[PDB]
Write a protein that binds this ligand. Structure first.
Ligand SMILES: [Ca+2]
Ligand code: NA
Length: 331
């Protein structure tokens, strides 16, 4: 039991970890990451090489600090609706219950988002027997706004299948493997829905978020440096709403700002430059008055994209609301 997270070192090494969603529950940091395994499945752009099967919840009392692995919180074998692939999760707390939101493919090989419930932030969690009605695609972030309303941000293109949901019904397994394939049109936007009071469903039809440049024009499909790929995250600073996300094939975490949960959000700049390994996935959390960026890389595995490790670093906002770009391997 030794302290970790002082010089951007891996927070845990006994398992591979990715896609960290960090929260402060009960005055502690709780982290909800994917648990990477060396499944030896084929590698490709639809992500079959990411064949995760369970979640472990991690916690820290301080940063740096000892990282507690609380064991298996949820196993894919116990989720009745799920076929494969437990991808980037998140958690929320309401009225003394804890909710784990997770993307997984159903038995028709279509990504949906499910919820599982516990009395403890560390789990374990009991999955609902079906996924959230009207959910689709991947990478949920459930954000509690200051007014007590909770919103799920979600979506991912390419293997996350968001490009196959243009009409509210799945376009089929022969549909686009990437995006709309119209680079001069506006890019695909992430999704948002207000959550129900009981946290098991959406309280409205799912909305799509507009992301625009500094001149107010939509980010285009061809603009891979700035357009949404996956890993939506929401935080607030100065009353401004910050939508951050991964750009996928250009390997950035970027951010965009707006004045309400639904946007539009105006692209501002880069949160995190590219890491070791193809994927880049993060969260941003305030703990004891300091802001932290949780992220991952493939450093521990010697550069294997599907065997990752989570890390943390301090994140600096300026008073005008801009954020200083982090480069992962400099200081
Ligand atoms: Ca996430
Ligand atoms: Na910048």
């Amino acid at each position: 039991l030794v302290p970790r997270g002082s010089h951007m070192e891996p927070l845990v090494t006994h398992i591979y970890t990715a896609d960290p969603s960090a929260h402060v529950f009960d005055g502690k940091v709780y982290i909800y990451p994917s648990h990477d395994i060396d499944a030896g499945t084929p590698e490709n752009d639809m992500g079959d090489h990411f064949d995760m099967r369970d979640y472990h919840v991690l916690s820290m009392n301080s940063i740096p600090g000892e990282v507690t692995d609380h064991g298996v919180a949820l196993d894919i074998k116990d989720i009745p609706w799920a076929g494969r692939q437990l991808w980037a999760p998140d958690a929320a707390s309401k009225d003394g219950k804890y909710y784990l939101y997770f993307p997984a493919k159903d038995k028709e090989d279509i990504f949906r988002i499910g919820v599982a419930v516990s009395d403890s932030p560390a789990g374990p969690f009991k999955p609902e027997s079906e996924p959230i009605k009207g959910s689709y695609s991947i990478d949920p972030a459930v954000f509690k706004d200051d007014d007590g309303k909770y919103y799920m941000y979600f979506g991912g293109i390419w293997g996350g299948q968001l490009q196959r949901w243009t009409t509210g019904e799945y376009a089929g397994h022969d549909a686009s493997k990437t995006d709309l394939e119209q680079d001069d049109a506006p890019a695909i936007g992430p999704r948002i829905a207000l959550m129900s009071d009981d946290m098991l469903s959406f309280a409205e039809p799912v909305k799509e978020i507009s992301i625009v440049d500094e001149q107010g024009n939509p980010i285009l499909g061809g603009d891979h440096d700035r357009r949404f790929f996956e890993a939506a995250w929401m935080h607030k600073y100065n009353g401004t709403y910050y939508l951050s996300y991964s750009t996928g094939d250009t390997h950035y975490i970027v951010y965009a700002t707006g004045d309400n949960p639904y946007g539009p959000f105006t692209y501002r700049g880069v949160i995190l430059n590219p890491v070791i390994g193809w994927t880049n996935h993060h969260s941003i959390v305030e703990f004891n008055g300091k802001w932290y960026l949780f992220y991952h890389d493939s450093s521990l595995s010697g550069g294997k994209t599907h065997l990752r490790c989570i890390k943390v670093t301090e994140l600096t906002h300026n008073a005008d609301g801009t954020i200083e770009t982090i480069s992962p391997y400099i200081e």
